[model samples]
Target: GADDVVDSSKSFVMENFSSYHGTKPGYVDSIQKGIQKPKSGTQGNYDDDWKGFYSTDNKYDAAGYSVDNENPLSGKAGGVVKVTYPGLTKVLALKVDNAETIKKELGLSLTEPLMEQVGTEEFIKRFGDGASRVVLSLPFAEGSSSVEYINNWEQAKALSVELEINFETRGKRGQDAMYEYMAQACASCINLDWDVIRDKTKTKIESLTGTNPVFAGANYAAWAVNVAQVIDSETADNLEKTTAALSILPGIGSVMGIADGAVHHNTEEIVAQSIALSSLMVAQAIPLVGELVDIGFAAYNFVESIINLFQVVHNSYNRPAYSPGHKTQPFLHDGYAVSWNTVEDSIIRTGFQGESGHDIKITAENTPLPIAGVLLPTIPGKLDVNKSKTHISVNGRKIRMRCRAIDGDVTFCRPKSPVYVGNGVHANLHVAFHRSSSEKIHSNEISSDSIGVLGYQKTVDHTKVNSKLSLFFEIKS
Candidate 1:
């Protein structure tokens, strides 16, 4: 019965046969790979100037941008080589196994053409032999590549390695290559997160089926949706969301100060704030302001609603985990506040900071806490649906960051999220900078004036978030 049903079991040998001293005497051939290879058709006894122009002059140069200096070199004689050579390279690539890095002293250097040729030839012989047939070459970096069948050892091994590690580790730049891809992917992630949030909310609104009145009130749910649309809209632009957030607040401190102190010594009153916010979102209307008033109230409530979620951000950047002591500094900056009454042409003056020394506003004038009716749990460590515990009391928080520890190289601090104005009916833009207190900067970690990068000397820009950059979403907090 089994034979008729097609027996499909197979066995594989895992043992490497060996004899005494069977270990191949791994001779470290001290190979001296020349740094410069004369061009294919240029090495001649012609005029010295002509030879220098083609070969001796070093036609190619590799340069890298460093914080203070430009590290440059001709051909493989630069930092790229410095970092790769003498390191260790594998043997045989796919056919043979590399034991060490392509470090110096090992004496292995091949002309770029030769390496390319070798790669090409191998690609051909394997594919042409019917020994294999698979796809080769990608249409684009972010596109699909060729794929073919592979049943043999070399083909299988090559495919496996490339998929698993070769592609990841092959590029000359190594980690630099990884960083480039990571940045792109992270940027895309931000776009994707906003899109997903928006689409889900929009679908809910359109369908009306299974839509709970309470869910409709979740301001963040709509915020997430709006952010997605913002990301997709060309008009929204890079700085619009961030700029808008800031224009609404006179200072981050006023909003954050209220948030920092949300925790309590005992009960669910603190947790109720989130619930109240939800109710306000779906409420018929706030009597005084009518529909507009209710809308404003909802916006403020949503600001408080995001506390737990935003805390995750504030806590994450502060340390490896959301806890005290790890201390990666957060965003902070000093500036004067601009009051509404000070400017005659208030609307235009508020948006444009043409003159220097003008105070950056955080809180909107006469704008009351939108979600004041929200009563959060007073219980210590009140955990939410997301599992974050309310550790600090409401009102104890500040919009600005508080630096607690500044070790020799690393710094730690707490960050606050932006508080919405008028039920956050409108997206608010917020910005601030953290200045280094050090007079003498010895490390990159100390000199970097960014919130995203943990530590580094020099004022490297952090691409992740920026108030000045007018980022749309909350970065550190």
Candidate 2:
């Protein structure tokens, strides 16, 4: 009885394999391949020229704006500053003067003495004010660079005095007198504690996602700009003074200067006030009021993080993963073939599985690669979904696709599914490609059984290939 049943179904799909034009038939063999392959072309180069991360040329340049040096020291240094560093072209710098102002306004008593405040250890630590060196390289005057000098606070202080000399002798000719003064201040007041504020904000951001802090170049710039703008526009001095006074207001002597000798102990409420005051001081720096007044300082950072997620601002150098004009030809798996075409403005990865177990898989030049069925990660300065059109087609049918982006990869896949599958009994099709925070797709059976009910018999494991890029089309008899 079993032999007769096998004889009846033996010719069902085996004869088709004989005429197959792709990989051989087996448990994981590819029969026919599609036109899509892993994209070989390098991502388009970002227009912003990026030097090495530690290089000064990585700073933003004032490409569109003209310089104004008349009365260079007229107002407090705010907004954009012009800077020059050794071995780098002249560039525009974004200085977070707000953090500087916060230090002074709060009367925090945090000070650096003769390289002791920010200190040698602090500068080498890569945290806090140490990170501001590139921005601090803004020359006191145009045509003057700070590359050779200003190695540390001691040197920075010396250079600050040199800038003052130029300010007095050289007149305002191309020199940013106010920025030069700001530079001097940075030598003394800017330190690890300043970085403390930023890290605290960063910690809060990472906490929201339950993940480590991952920042794109543009994202960091956005956060920097937002913080600078908020502080630059608000009254830092008044807020600090008010917060300070509130902390001492509990005791009558501390409050009204009434009891000359009245000693005020630190009450729990007063201690609480100090903490609240710290947050309030930073909030006042943002100009948020009323109900939003009590918000955490990190809340502003969170808002900026979301804004950066949907927006793209180019201020720093970004190297694309792929280069232009690069191409990857299609490869065959069981009987499926998939290839991707990428240009400056668009990117596409598609696969087609024929009747036989035809599939396509693309490996990498390097081995033991962490692969994906399909991948579309956004480049830092290129192909932002906000400015690009993206879609996908399966089996000659165009379907809706959602693009998700994260630190390392951008993925595109169907958000909803009634995903159609062609005719075949051993139609093992499961596609899963993912990067953290990206959209992922996993499928078992393709059926005509409406949404979420695609109950099919056979299943294929596409991810089982274990390569950088794996596409599978399996057939079982």
Candidate 3:
């Protein structure tokens, strides 16, 4: 979810506000002129104008003070702040410095944008890493650098949307040509000097987007959520959902692999149960055709029951019971924003930690499923369970299992492999499940044929025994 926050915000700034220069396919500017102006409308130039506007209009004497760098309007040009997540870091909140030089040398004002001006050597001196450019980096756990953690699911969903704004362009234009075009558009929208719009556009884009992959993260999460939905949604055609599911297949496998490494991998029956459980939604979507759906859903429910059984793993630990204090918390189902760097650091960066920020232990389920949330937990006094997955104990009669998770998904592994259980040796169980707050599963496991295994039959057992269960999950993107 944090990934979406950074990703979308950066994307909005990069795609809508900034311009890419010299990198364009066809550029006719001379080398001298080209270097001076990376793009017409870029965050670099826009920031430059902001710097000038602050300097000329509000003449704050920096010599006498600690330098009010925090003042967006009074700083030398612009300032920057660094943002850090579980394993990712980046910068945001920028302002420009130096305004008088442009007014005197370039005959420009804050109201006049950089896109309208064409320069060679002079432009270089202004923005080319000169003394006037004052860039700052903000780190988490520092002053005014509090890292927003996503520890709940609902928060994750809300954040996901907010972080994925459609506007705010970044640098990607050449010769600042696109800057001029966007500047004109910006001017029309904000009702400002056309030139000023050009400069602002350039400054916002180049400055914000350049630091990270702001847009890439949210897209990936959206993709992940969509895939999960297809698998969980009955309306989704098997062919279509399966194809879309492919997008996250590797990710799902990665979680499973983590479980295997942890020695808590699910039995073949559980895996098969999961597949069958996934089809229940498809059956239930149609009221009249419900029977056919019931047939499929029954199989799905079987897998889910086994998965639900593992909830006992989460229950083993003590989690703060819900009270008035918990008015604000996130859930897995909650749609939240995710960003590229956040995703990169948490999921991709961890290499094997499985991008889960806070491992939620739901209370109502009786069975232990991870509670959902967006904000990762950074509470000084609170412990982070995500470092180590949950623990589980499976009391399945003949081949009982008791295991603790240290790597990825919490699972129950039997000793000496799986022992063969004769048919009718065990009782035929029918579990009646009541609906809870979990957004993913809403079913009743009516019956099951207790089956045993020789080795791992990944497909059949996985879909059957693991029905109605969510084994491995991650924050979107």
Best by TM-score: 1
Query: RMSD (Cα, Å) of candidate 2?
Result: 30.8
How many clashes in each structure?
79, 43, 124
Which ranking of candidates, highest TM-score first?
A: 1, 3, 2
Q: Which lDDT tens digits does candidate 2 get at residues 1-477?
A: 212211222112111011001110120111112112223321111111111111122111111111122211111112222222222111112221122232343232224221133224443233222233321222221111322111232222211100111222323312233223223323212111122233344344332112211221111222222332333222233333221112111111111111111112123232222222233334444454233333453344323222121111000001111121214454433322323232211212223110001112122221111112234334333223321112222221112233354334343432211221111101112222211222222222221111011111111363212122232222122
Cα lDDT tens digits, model 1, 94-141, are 211111111111222322221222234354353233222222111110
Point out the worst 10-residue segment of candidate 1 by lDDT: 17-26
Q: Estimate each model's TM-score.
A: 0.20, 0.16, 0.19
Instruction: Show where candidate 3 strays beyond 4 Å.
Output: 1-93, 96-108, 111-121, 130-272, 284-477
TM-score of 1: 0.20
lDDT of each: 0.21, 0.22, 0.22
lDDT of 3 at 110: 33
Q: In angstroms, how far off is 178's CA in candidate 2?
A: 68
Q: What are the C-alpha RMSDs, in order, of all predicted structures?
A: 24.9, 30.8, 26.5
- Give a tens-digit lDDT track for model 3, residues 74-97: 111211111111211122221211
Rank order by lDDT, top first? 2, 3, 1
Candidate 3: lDDT of 423?
11
The true-versus-predicted C-alpha distance at residue 213 of model 1, in Å, is 29
Model 1: residues with Cα > 4 Å off, grouped in runs: 1-272, 278-477
